[PDB]
Swiss-Prot record:
This is Yop proteins translocation protein U. Component of the yop secretion machinery. It is found in: Cell membrane. Belongs to the type III secretion exporter family. Signal peptide: none annotated. The gene is yscU. The lineage of its organism: Bacteria, Pseudomonadati, Pseudomonadota, Gammaproteobacteria, Enterobacterales.
Length: 58
């Protein structure tokens, strides 16, 4: 019963270490691309057409 708790606890430590490793991956470059991706997201087609509207465009 309580034994499983210890095993899970150990795994938690591994997860924390991974976070630091991710930093070494130099995600700064990828982070820059994400910023631009957000801009393109606002250009969603859904936003172009409103659900409430029906006589929009042809």
């Amino acid at each position: 019963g309580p034994l499983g708790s210890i095993k899970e606890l150990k795994m938690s430590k591994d997860e924390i270490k991974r976070e630091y490793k991710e930093m070494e991956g130099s995600p700064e470059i990828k982070s820059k691309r994400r910023q631009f991706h957000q801009e393109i997201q606002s250009r969603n087609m859904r936003e172009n057409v409103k659900r409430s509207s029906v006589v929009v465009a042809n």
